[PDB]
Amino acid sequence: PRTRIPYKPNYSLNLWSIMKNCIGKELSKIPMPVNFNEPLSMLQRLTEDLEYHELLDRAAKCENSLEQLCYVAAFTVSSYSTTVFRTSKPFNPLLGETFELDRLEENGYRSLCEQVSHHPPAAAHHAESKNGWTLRQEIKITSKFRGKYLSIMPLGTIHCIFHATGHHYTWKKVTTTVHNIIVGKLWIDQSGEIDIVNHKTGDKCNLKFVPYSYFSRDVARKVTGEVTDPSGKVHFALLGTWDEKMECFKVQSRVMLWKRNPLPKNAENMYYFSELALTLNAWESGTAPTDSRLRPDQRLMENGRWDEANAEKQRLEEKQRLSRKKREAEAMKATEDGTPYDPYKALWFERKKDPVTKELTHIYRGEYWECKEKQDWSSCPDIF
Amino acid sequence: PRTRIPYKPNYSLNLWSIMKNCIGKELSKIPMPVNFNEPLSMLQRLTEDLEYHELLDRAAKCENSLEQLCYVAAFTVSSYSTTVFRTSKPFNPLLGETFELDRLEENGYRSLCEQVSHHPPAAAHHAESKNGWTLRQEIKITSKFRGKYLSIMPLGTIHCIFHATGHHYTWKKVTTTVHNIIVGKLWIDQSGEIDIVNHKTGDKCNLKFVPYSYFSRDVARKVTGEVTDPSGKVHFALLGTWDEKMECFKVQPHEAEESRVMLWKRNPLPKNAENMYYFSELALTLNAWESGTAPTDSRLRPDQRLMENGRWDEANAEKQRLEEKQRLSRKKREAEAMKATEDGTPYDPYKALWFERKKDPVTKELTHIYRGEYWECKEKQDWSSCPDI
Amino acid sequence: GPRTRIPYKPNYSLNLWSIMKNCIGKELSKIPMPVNFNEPLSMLQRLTEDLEYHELLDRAAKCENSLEQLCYVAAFTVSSYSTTVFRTSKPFNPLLGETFELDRLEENGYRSLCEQVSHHPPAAAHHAESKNGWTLRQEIKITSKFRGKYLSIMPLGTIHCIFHATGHHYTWKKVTTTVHNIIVGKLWIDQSGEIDIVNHKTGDKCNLKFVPYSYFSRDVARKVTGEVTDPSGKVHFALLGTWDEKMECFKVQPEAEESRVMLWKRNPLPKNAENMYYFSELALTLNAWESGTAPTDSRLRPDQRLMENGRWDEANAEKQRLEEKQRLSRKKREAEAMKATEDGTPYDPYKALWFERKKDPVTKELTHIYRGEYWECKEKQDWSSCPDIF
Amino acid sequence: PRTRIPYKPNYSLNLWSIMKNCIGKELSKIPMPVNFNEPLSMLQRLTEDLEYHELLDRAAKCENSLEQLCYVAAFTVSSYSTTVFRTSKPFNPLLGETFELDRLEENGYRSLCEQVSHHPPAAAHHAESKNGWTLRQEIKITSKFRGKYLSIMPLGTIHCIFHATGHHYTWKKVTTTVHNIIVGKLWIDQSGEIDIVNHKTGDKCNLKFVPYSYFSRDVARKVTGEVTDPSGKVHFALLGTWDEKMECFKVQSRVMLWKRNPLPKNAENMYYFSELALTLNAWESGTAPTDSRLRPDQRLMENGRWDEANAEKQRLEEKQRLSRKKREAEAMKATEDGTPYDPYKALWFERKKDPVTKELTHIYRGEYWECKEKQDWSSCPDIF
Ligand SMILES: CC(C)CCC[C@@H](C)[C@H]1CC[C@H]2[C@@H]3CC=C4C[C@@H](O)CC[C@]4(C)[C@H]3CC[C@]12C
Ligand SMILES: CC(C)CCC[C@@H](C)[C@H]1CC[C@H]2[C@@H]3CC=C4C[C@@H](O)CC[C@]4(C)[C@H]3CC[C@]12C
Numbered sequence A, D: 001p002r003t004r005i006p007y008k009p010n011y012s013l014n015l016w017s018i019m020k021n022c023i024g025k026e027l028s029k030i031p032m033p034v035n036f037n038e039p040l041s042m043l044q045r046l047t048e049d050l051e052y053h054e055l056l057d058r059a060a061k062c063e064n065s066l067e068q069l070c071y072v073a074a075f076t077v078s079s080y081s082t083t084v085f086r087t088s089k090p091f092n093p094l095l096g097e098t099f100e101l102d103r104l105e106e107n108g109y110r111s112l113c114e115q116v117s118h119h120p121p122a123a124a125h126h127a128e129s130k131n132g133w134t135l136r137q138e139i140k141i142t143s144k145f146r147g148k149y150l151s152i153m154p155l156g157t158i159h160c161i162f163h164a165t166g167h168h169y170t171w172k173k174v175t176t177t178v179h180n181i182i183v184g185k186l187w188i189d190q191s192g193e194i195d196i197v198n199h200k201t202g203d204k205c206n207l208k209f210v211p212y213s214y215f216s217r218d219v220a221r222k223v224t225g226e227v228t229d230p231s232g233k234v235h236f237a238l239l240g241t242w243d244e245k246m247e248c249f250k251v252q253s254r255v256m257l258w259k260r261n262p263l264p265k266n267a268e269n270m271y272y273f274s275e276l277a278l279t280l281n282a283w284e285s286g287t288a289p290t291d292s293r294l295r296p297d298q299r300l301m302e303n304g305r306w307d308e309a310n311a312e313k314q315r316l317e318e319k320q321r322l323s324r325k326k327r328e329a330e331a332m333k334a335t336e337d338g339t340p341y342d343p344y345k346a347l348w349f350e351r352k353k354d355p356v357t358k359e360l361t362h363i364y365r366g367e368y369w370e371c372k373e374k375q376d377w378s379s380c381p382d383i384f
Numbered sequence B: 001p002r003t004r005i006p007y008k009p010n011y012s013l014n015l016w017s018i019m020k021n022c023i024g025k026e027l028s029k030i031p032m033p034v035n036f037n038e039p040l041s042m043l044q045r046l047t048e049d050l051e052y053h054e055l056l057d058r059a060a061k062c063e064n065s066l067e068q069l070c071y072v073a074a075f076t077v078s079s080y081s082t083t084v085f086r087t088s089k090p091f092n093p094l095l096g097e098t099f100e101l102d103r104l105e106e107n108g109y110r111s112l113c114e115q116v117s118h119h120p121p122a123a124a125h126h127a128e129s130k131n132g133w134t135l136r137q138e139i140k141i142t143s144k145f146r147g148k149y150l151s152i153m154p155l156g157t158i159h160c161i162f163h164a165t166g167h168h169y170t171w172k173k174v175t176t177t178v179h180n181i182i183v184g185k186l187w188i189d190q191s192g193e194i195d196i197v198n199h200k201t202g203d204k205c206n207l208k209f210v211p212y213s214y215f216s217r218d219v220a221r222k223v224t225g226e227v228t229d230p231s232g233k234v235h236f237a238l239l240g241t242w243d244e245k246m247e248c249f250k251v252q253p254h255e256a257e258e259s260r261v262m263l264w265k266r267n268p269l270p271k272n273a274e275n276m277y278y279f280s281e282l283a284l285t286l287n288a289w290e291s292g293t294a295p296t297d298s299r300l301r302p303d304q305r306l307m308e309n310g311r312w313d314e315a316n317a318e319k320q321r322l323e324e325k326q327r328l329s330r331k332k333r334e335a336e337a338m339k340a341t342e343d344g345t346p347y348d349p350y351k352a353l354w355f356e357r358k359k360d361p362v363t364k365e366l367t368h369i370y371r372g373e374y375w376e377c378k379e380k381q382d383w384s385s386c387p388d389i
Numbered sequence C: 001g002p003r004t005r006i007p008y009k010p011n012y013s014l015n016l017w018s019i020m021k022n023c024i025g026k027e028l029s030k031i032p033m034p035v036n037f038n039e040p041l042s043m044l045q046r047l048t049e050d051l052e053y054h055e056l057l058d059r060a061a062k063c064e065n066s067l068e069q070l071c072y073v074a075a076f077t078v079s080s081y082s083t084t085v086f087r088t089s090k091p092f093n094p095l096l097g098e099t100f101e102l103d104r105l106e107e108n109g110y111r112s113l114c115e116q117v118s119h120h121p122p123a124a125a126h127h128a129e130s131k132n133g134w135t136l137r138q139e140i141k142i143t144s145k146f147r148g149k150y151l152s153i154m155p156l157g158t159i160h161c162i163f164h165a166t167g168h169h170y171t172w173k174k175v176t177t178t179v180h181n182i183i184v185g186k187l188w189i190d191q192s193g194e195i196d197i198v199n200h201k202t203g204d205k206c207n208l209k210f211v212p213y214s215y216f217s218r219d220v221a222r223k224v225t226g227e228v229t230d231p232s233g234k235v236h237f238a239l240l241g242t243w244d245e246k247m248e249c250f251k252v253q254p255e256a257e258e259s260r261v262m263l264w265k266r267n268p269l270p271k272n273a274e275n276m277y278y279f280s281e282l283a284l285t286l287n288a289w290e291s292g293t294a295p296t297d298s299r300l301r302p303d304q305r306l307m308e309n310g311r312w313d314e315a316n317a318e319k320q321r322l323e324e325k326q327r328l329s330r331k332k333r334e335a336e337a338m339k340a341t342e343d344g345t346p347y348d349p350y351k352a353l354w355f356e357r358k359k360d361p362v363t364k365e366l367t368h369i370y371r372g373e374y375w376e377c378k379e380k381q382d383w384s385s386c387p388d389i390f
């Protein structure tokens, strides 16, 4: 495993200087350097949901459906434990970029995500486990800069299947807002409601993320929840804070669920990366040529070689723009010649209608690991 | 009731010349004149869903919940009956623009739409009827021009509640594509699946819109469907074409009339509709001037009235003026937010007038719901709105 | 090895829509066009190209499970359409007595033979026996219709595949083929419809659905889905793919890609095939000179060889000569029938040489079955020299 | 009911003079006057298959599927009882021409035929009975004149459904040849095999029609048959002649006997019409405007007005030709303007894939009798 990555240098670049006039625009359309990023891609950032994968591993061994949903809800809230300290923008991943995590013997799963689209940005992620579950999602990130705060709505639906019982849990994301852009330290806060539904049994769960108010009495970053049966009974209750702990009680004896693992040593200068976040961008053999570990500007930023990372990002973005212009030119030729035109489609994911949520979602085809074992790539375009 | 609008002028403007290099761009970001529009706003076009409101009126008188879902399924398809001929772009409504339709004695409902946002574009629609139902929705229109076709996806969820029984139906729209852009003559095609769900009684309905193919041996523009009970299966089956008719039969594993419970037939277009933008009989009466409306109603938009009366060149100049006023107002709001952000002073962002953004308790989505205050303010005739139009 | 390169296609600018402008609703056989839109192959050779992926049938003969064998046969039915994606040229309308052989026992493992049995309506009988334990036969009557936007081609007929070792007799029809975008020039082909395979020995069935290409669709282009059922109605194997590239048959139980039983990948086009009528690696060696064939073989047709070497201007005149020769011969047959009917003398009508028109015992239809006399006569080289069609 | 039609006039026109040079052509492409026709359309001639509907009426009351198949097999031969003397060509129906037979109380069925396609000629026929059966078919008439004889092959598949048991019998027609055209004295002969298959039980039946030979092997116009179970046993045996009778014996002695109804009085001068064939072209109320009873040239020829009937047939053929040219011009405009084009479709029949025969056939949609009840029509083209 790989820990201790080089620290963040001090270049004194005022964030407000670039985002001064860019009020009301999307974060993707805001030209930014690499100084305010972290050496991880959005795919690597998204795969971190499996940081507390033991919750799903223990949930697979629950006979009671309601108690299993209590475990699933704790897994939904556990993902925001990295949001307390990590206040950096991960690299906007390229159109064909992917990222794998083949950690079956050490952890028990094989994760794989790939950018399905860039206009608009969307990323499909799928992870298979040997303990009897599978987690998949397609996240389309939308954002808006209002001046005082930066609002981020990671749109999309997350699925979690349990092969032993057939339980299919699904839930949406919560809205995330980042404060203190002009001056002072940066901090993040989630607010809204997450509604989990089990389509196999009919169980539901409602989690409420309370926004921070000074005179609210409500503790900061508080999360309350209730898991209900198809009839109406409240049964179990959830309480905690997404910054520290989360416990599951019963109503009619306290079971307790999730406590975040502490940050590694001297992590204050390593972008506040978790112990799992360190091993994400470690070089690995047998990955696809479009994996995030091979992105040049990301590695150039990880080792502290800035200024050149800006130029490498500029070149990579110009490459993607020329590829898009060529694809549009092919479509323009095909529409005038009368020939059919087949647009861009994702490589390892297919856009089909989800049978339970009735949503156009990207599902894993099931041929990435086979091709990785056989080491037959090439297919993947020259992205970097 | 207005029965005929001035005819459509003949201006020779090549559409492909404008969208030649505009490959991959959004329709809102496509600089085009008023020549390829219709004298209706997107709010009025969205209000046209109530054209076949008799289906919901008869659905309110259905004791069987499954048969009521059979009526609602035909109501979902009835909205696409107007797309067969009308291949014109409705006016992109301004930020504060609204549109009312207070037709209780003539039709039996009160419709109200308002453009809720422009980044991204969203429009909230709410219409309550005295016959026992209410229809509401928030439509965020997304579009993309890929060359061969221009795809339009009206994202959003539509609700239809029956207060007497409490039935709450919800369904999404289907993907619409307009083809043949290089050459003048345009044609439209719908394709995809509509999934209706009743949240009070667990029964569901699935409609399948078959795409038009170069060589297909099915009927053109055919739609098939099934009505299933909660945790069961097919109780009714419906089939037809969104070009003309839609029939809903019953299954029991003779001729056609014996096993058919509900038929829907579209009313034909009025006389000389070839020169009136192929407007329906209901579409003609939408942009007729009415007294007692809000100052932001679509009937008062200068671009539409200038184009309806055939004064297209002035409509182009006026649309450029209206869009520049909206852009300057947006930049002024951005400057106010920037100064409040630097000084620490509080800032009140833009909020919709007649709609409030709350989480829907059944669909768990942040949608704009009508705050019952438009009709009450209309009777007292006090309007503290904006000067967008 | 065999022939791997033919002379290139010349660049002759002839507007196709100018000829098919007024001929709306007519058959492709009755529409007068030059040789510019043809390929140096006959319909008999084009039909013989069905045996391109015979490895699927070779492996199917070695399947103990009947249902598992049906997956290989089902992939063989779709494999023939892998060549239609780019090759959009009209094969020569063969003469009435024209034949075509393919005696490839050591190199491929079969003996194929085709003969035009009739021209009114057009019909061609094909029969190919293999030493790997199977036999493929068919009679294809090609009907067509030009509707304006597209040219519809329906190769009507029933094709059979028998396995001598087990007695399995598979039967299936072809799918509808349409060539679109004729008005401008850059024309393209698409198949659509359903193939229904039936095993008459066991009762297993298979259904393949070819989805038509549509203006807007969010599924894969040229997609084909299929299911194989036992005589009771239970779906054992399921297959999916695209006739543009691949076709896979997995197993269902009514994780990943571990249930895969049979994958079929199309053989890529040879080098510089861009200018060789997009011929496959097998399509090139079809019109290569062969010894010991019948005098009515397609390799001896003057129009194909005259056009293959790039002399299209003379190939048009030779096509006119052959068509007028065939028409005069048919007028001679009609005059003989009229004289024999007025004189009361018996009349012996035209009958096929290497095929016999008998009732098929399985499909109960009047089909042309191989008589069993072509290869034997080829060994002794005693051709009848009576047709004289070229 | 109609029991006597006007007699056939005597016109001295040599048929061989017209078909002298038309050897090898299709009967549809051979220009002929009305002198060699009969006052019936091809739809009415095809509807004459229901002449011996009592066979299906008794077949619906048969418990044994094999014994029922003997009745069905006799019904297949019963249709050829009229061809022994009737040597006239029915009128080639127009594109929109239909023909109804609403005889529920008198016979027990509702028949409807429609010319579904022209070029090539095709006719769909459907008849539902209240006695427990339904008969449907789509017949594409193909022909060829070889000089001595005219070969006619009525291609298509005929279906017979029994609602009580679900038995679905299917069989094709047999080839019919008309000889002695040069002299003038016409005679007809059938030859070939009819193969009936029951898809619900698996029973099969094979009928052999022997052609006329000079060496006269036993009886003329003989028909032999066998009724077999799905295993292989020849439970029943069939014998008879399509000239008179047809009987079904048992093997290890008479279950299903078919006797031909004789021709009515003075039928020698009425085109040898059967007792049912006379009532076919009788005027009926409440019919569609495209029914064969309203065809002008056909009725003009029925009353002996031949010379004028030729001109009326020329008018109808040119009208249909102009309509087809208009359809072709619409398609030519649609292909160049890029607008979609929807070709001609049948009115009362839909061309779908049959679930049992897996073939593209025209099935009755079920809307003719309802529209007859409401008496609207109009929607039908101006065919006459
Ligand atoms: C520095 C400023 C300008 C921008 C910072 C943006 C950062 C804080 C945003 C951008 C996208 C966000 C992520 C979007 C989606 C998810 C998945 C969820 O299951 C956990 C939170 C997580 C992982 C978010 C964490 C915060 C995040 C990384
Ligand atoms: C002029 C060219 C470039 C663009 C034309 C775009 C037209 C055809 C598009 C733009 C907006 C579209 C509408 C958006 C939403 C709805 C509501 C739905 O319930 C029925 C279809 C309907 C009413 C659409 C019909 C087609 C439409 C009017």
Ligand SMILES: CC(C)CCC[C@@H](C)[C@H]1CC[C@H]2[C@@H]3CC=C4C[C@@H](O)CC[C@]4(C)[C@H]3CC[C@]12C
Residues within 6 Å of the ligand: C037, C038, C046, C047, C050, C080, C081, C084, C087, C088, C089, C090, C091, C142, C151, C153, C155, C174, C177, C179, C189
């Ligand atoms: C160029 C224009 C004028 C006409 C083009 C006609 C071409 C495209 C047509 C004519 C006959 C057709 C062939 C007829 C039969 C078969 C056998 C089938 O198993 C695969 C397709 C195949 C091999 C067809 C391919 C397309 C084909 C070659």
Ligand SMILES: CC(C)CCC[C@@H](C)[C@H]1CC[C@H]2[C@@H]3CC=C4C[C@@H](O)CC[C@]4(C)[C@H]3CC[C@]12C
Residues within 6 Å of the ligand: D036, D037, D045, D046, D049, D079, D080, D083, D086, D087, D088, D089, D090, D150, D152, D154, D173, D176, D178, D188
């Ligand atoms: C006058 C000369 C030139 C041509 C005469 C053609 C006549 C004899 C032919 C043309 C079409 C034929 C019919 C076609 C189909 C059927 C249906 C079958 O179930 C019984 C025989 C029957 C009813 C045929 C009887 C003979 C028939 C009427």
